[PDB]
Amino acid sequence: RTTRDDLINGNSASCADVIFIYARGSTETGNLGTLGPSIASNLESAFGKDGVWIQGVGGAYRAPLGDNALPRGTSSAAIREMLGLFQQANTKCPDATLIAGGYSQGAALAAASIEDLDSAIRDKIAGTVLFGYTKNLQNRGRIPNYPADRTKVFCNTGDLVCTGSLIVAAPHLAYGPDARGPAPEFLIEKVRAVRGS
């Protein structure tokens, strides 16, 4: 449901083939918030429960609304937390394919993290989905240092954070259908593109 720590809890001797690391939006609960669980269930349907590990960014990432105003759109402590989880995945399960996602502040966090990541680990993230991407305009719809073909941004018309503002309007809260269909669809496709099946 809203907390999944499959990577932290996972046995190194029986690594999943796919590891998904997801950062929730501001003020959301657990470490998956409102959108994460929907994505998780569909990935589990595609890869099987033992086939994918779902890991939300918890720990120091408290997702405070105020941190949207910081330079990178989230705090340094939150970035360190997510970097730490990619590095844990890379160490625990060197052969797993990674996928990532974030909503709102979590999308800025995912983008900042991936930008700072060691390239060898960044290169293992086969696809990333961003919903209500707060740095969409500033970054021109891209994640720095990460390929456009592995990136999918869901930015609703009228969601002001996609257009350089930090105002929360009703479209910002309307990503439910995307998390249920096109976002897991994209992620599954990108994993299969490199792993076959």
Swiss-Prot record:
Disulfide bridge positions per record: C15-C93, C155-C162
Function, in words: Catalyzes the hydrolysis of complex carboxylic polyesters found in the cell wall of plants. Degrades cutin, a macromolecule that forms the structure of the plant cuticle. Allows pathogenic fungi to penetrate through the cuticular barrier into the host plant during the initial stage of fungal infection.
Activity regulation annotation text: Inhibited by n-undecyl phosphonate (C11Y4). Inhibited by paraoxon.
UniProt note: pH dependence: Optimum pH is 8.
Modifications the protein undergoes after translation, according to the UniProt entry: The 2 disulfide bonds play a critical role in holding the catalytic residues in juxta-position; reduction of the disulfide bridges results in the complete inactivation of the enzyme.
UniProt keyword terms in alphabetical order: Disulfide bond, Glycoprotein, Hydrolase, Secreted, Serine esterase, Signal, Virulence
Species name: Fusarium vanettenii
Listed GO MF terms: cutinase activity
EC nos: 3.1.1.74
Keyword Glycoprotein: yes
GO terms for cellular component: extracellular region
Pfam families recorded: Cutinase (PF01083)
UniProt protein name: Cutinase 1
Catalytic activity of the protein: cutin + H2O = cutin monomers
Result, substituting S26A: Severely decreases activity on p-nitrophenyl butyrate
GO biological process: carbohydrate catabolic process
Outcome of mutating L65A: Increases activity on p-nitrophenyl butyrate
Temperature dependence: Optimum temperature is below 30 degrees Celsius. Optimum temperature is 30-40 degrees Celsius.
Source organism, top-level taxon: Eukaryota
Main subcellular localisation: secreted
Practical uses of the protein: May have promising applications in chemical and textile industries as it is capable of hydrolyzing a variety of substrates including soluble esters and insoluble triglycerides. Can hydrolyze and thus modulate the surface properties of synthetic fibers such as the plastic poly(ethylene terephthalate) (PET), or the textile fibers polyamide 6,6, polyester and acrylic.
Effect of V168A: Increases activity on p-nitrophenyl butyrate and poly(ethylene terephthalate) (PET)
Gene3D superfamilies, alphabetized: alpha/beta hydrolase (3.40.50.1820)
Localization of this protein: Secreted
Site (Transition state stabilizer): S26, Q105
InterPro entries: AB_hydrolase_fold (IPR029058), Cutinase/axe (IPR000675), CUTINASE_1 (IPR043580), CUTINASE_2 (IPR043579), Cutinase_monf (IPR011150)
Active site, UniProt feature: S104 (nucleophile), D159, H172 (proton donor/acceptor)
